[PDB]
Ligand binder design. Sequence first.
Ligand SMILES: [Mg+2]
Ligand SMILES: [Mg+2]
Ligand SMILES: [Mg+2]
Ligand SMILES: [Mg+2]
Ligand SMILES: [Mg+2]
Ligand SMILES: [Mg+2]
Ligand SMILES: [Mg+2]
Ligand SMILES: [Mg+2]
Ligand SMILES: [Mg+2]
Ligand SMILES: [Mg+2]
Ligand SMILES: [Mg+2]
Ligand SMILES: [Mg+2]
Ligand SMILES: [Mg+2]
Lengths: 54, 177, 136, 104
Amino acid sequence: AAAGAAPRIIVKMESSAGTGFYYTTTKNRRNTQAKLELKKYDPVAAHVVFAAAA
Amino acid sequence: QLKTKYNDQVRPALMQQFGYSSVMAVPRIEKIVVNEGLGSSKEDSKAIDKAAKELALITLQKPIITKAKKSISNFKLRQGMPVGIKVTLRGERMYVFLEKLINIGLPRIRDFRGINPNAFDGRGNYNLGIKEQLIFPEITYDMVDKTRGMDITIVTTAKTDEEARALLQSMGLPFRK
Amino acid sequence: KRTKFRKQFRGRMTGDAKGGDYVAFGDYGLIAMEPAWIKSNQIEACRIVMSRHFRRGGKIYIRIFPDKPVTKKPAETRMGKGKGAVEYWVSVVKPGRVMFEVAGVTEEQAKEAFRLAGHKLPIQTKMVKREVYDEA
Amino acid sequence: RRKLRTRRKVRTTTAASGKLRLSVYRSSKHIYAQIIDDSRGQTLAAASSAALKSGNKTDTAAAVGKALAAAAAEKGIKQVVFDRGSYKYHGRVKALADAAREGG
RNA sequence: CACCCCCGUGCCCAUAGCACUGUGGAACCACCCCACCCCAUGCCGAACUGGGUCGUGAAACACAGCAGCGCCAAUGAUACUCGGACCGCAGGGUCCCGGAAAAGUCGGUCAGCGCGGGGGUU
RNA sequence: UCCCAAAAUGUAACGGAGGCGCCCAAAGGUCACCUCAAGACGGUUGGAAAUCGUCUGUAGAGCGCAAAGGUAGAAGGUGGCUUGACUGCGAGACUGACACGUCGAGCAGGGAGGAAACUCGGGCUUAGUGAACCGGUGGUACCGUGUGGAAGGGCCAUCG
RNA sequence: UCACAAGGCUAAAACCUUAUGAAACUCCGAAGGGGCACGCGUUUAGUCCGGGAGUGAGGCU
Ligand SMILES: [Mg+2]
Ligand SMILES: [Mg+2]
Ligand SMILES: [Mg+2]
Ligand SMILES: [Mg+2]
Ligand SMILES: [Mg+2]
Ligand SMILES: [Mg+2]
Ligand SMILES: [Mg+2]
Ligand SMILES: [Mg+2]
Ligand SMILES: [Mg+2]
Ligand SMILES: [Mg+2]
Ligand SMILES: [Mg+2]
Ligand SMILES: [Mg+2]
Ligand SMILES: [Mg+2]
């Protein structure tokens, strides 16, 4: 969207699977503070949980 | 405990007094309800801690923090924040704390001569809240900080106020005449 | 006269008078005959006329009331740029509607106070006298 | 307070489900577990517990689960839906369950 | 259902609701009693839950009475109005033809139709 | 979003009012549980309003924001577990001049909650948006100019 | 919901009788309209594929 973006930021959720695959959504930094930890499907295998890469 | 038996000896007392066609159709006692509505001006975490302590030490039952109904009038009010403290006593511990009260409470009350006999819950029940805390069996000024007071509400399953009244008194209760 | 708080602007349309064609609160009554608009000041005028003629005190029921905002654009403006800003207030008196009720005065007094009010009015009128018990 | 029952009741999609729903009633120390074809205003099987009970008051749940499911064998009922009540699926009505849930 | 009654559960979603009122008890329901555990309380067996009585049917429920309230609601006429034609400078209004309300008056109503089970008819 | 808008949709004006360019890691998925505003009587600080109790109580409340519709058998308030705020698709419609846009059963992989029937491909819904072009980044090994490599492009993703 | 006429009543609000306005009020609610099936009954248009357009200032009641 736009640059200034203090609350909510487009973060990319990259896999642990080392496949290559990632996701994108938004986190508030008011409430995530540290990191983001989520469990979604991987289409290069089946279902292997990612972490909030920059 | 014993108080239960005394209720069961008030039961033919009120059966005989009122001529009830049934023994369950007689005034009984549902819960005791202890409120502690400090807050509004007392926004101190320390203070609601103290009220928790005091309540837990007299009533022998954990107390609930009844928050602000989120009504925020001109003066000091707000959304979801501690403003009152409730402890609902019924059954056993009701009878235990209530006997603690007739026994050691209103007697040890500074300048005591009974309470208001003019009608309460005209539906047929009766409340009565009580002030000071320096008039107690368990509360001490040698185990607190400042000085407070509370609220008390019984539910007589009566049908009018004369019948409530009767139950109350013959259960052992001071009516200031 | 005016309403006290509202929404602001309005519109215009017509057919015959809803309620009420009947004579409550009084013994004699004055009735519209024409689909007018009626401004505060026009009533104010009728009120002051009749109030004077009755002296102290009689009894005066001003049934009609101006809730309708009428606007007028500023002086010398080309159309558009907006809607005109609330010039004055009208009360949409439809025919047959009873505008006035007076009582505590003779028939004569009523006739006169009426006629005097009538000459101050944008529209023809007629006076009448009770029997209209549709309800009470 | 009637909210729990009419809640789960509508939450059991009556007809469009296909399956048959199965009532209970363990409030008193007598129950009624009915089996209903919802749509048609008719009640199929059923297996009460007030025409002799052995003696058990809540221990007998498994019994009438097994008894009901027994009626279900004969009438030919293999599919089901569990219409509980204000009853929070725990002990007694869980017994009636597990019982019918094997003894079909 | 054989006749009643009670328990569940439905179609119906107030002419089916509420109040006042009477009836009801071991035969279903209810309160009841106990709770260290299953289970559960933003606190408390109040509620969910669990072991079970007697006692009471007073509360609640079921049933009956009732038209105070609520709800349902005519005919008659009217409002408006398709479509035929008209008057008024205009605000607005009329005639013919069919359709036709709302509110109100008459009233109507303390519902009706099922399924299953239990328990009774010396 | 409402009114205009003439009881189908649609419909203009420098006509009449008001919001948006977000927010939420729980405000989502599921599972389970709870019922509101307000007034009247009586209640230690209070005493217009606080917190407790009884009675009334179909919505006179609440829904992150505008309003409209909607909603008490929940969308409203609370808790447990959670990552369906998922890939590969899309029967069939709504809607637009086109491009767009919207709803969506059902199949596969593979998971979440539930005892289970089941529900979940974001949020009660309707705003929270930017077509191409040129470029950044992670994967991919489709083309690669004698051949084999590599520069470079292409594809899916994605940021400006 | 907002606005409003006389009175009651009360400490003013709520509430009671009487009484009324509303594009952005609605317990209700027509005439008419719109979709679909038939054609129970008359009549002539339609739809699709392809060639050629012009029009996109409208005017009055
Ligand atoms: Mg005409
Ligand atoms: Mg006619
Ligand atoms: Mg007719
Ligand atoms: Mg009855
Ligand atoms: Mg139209
Ligand atoms: Mg146009
Ligand atoms: Mg270019
Ligand atoms: Mg690349
Ligand atoms: Mg490359
Ligand atoms: Mg009516
Ligand atoms: Mg042009
Ligand atoms: Mg043009
Ligand atoms: Mg034109």
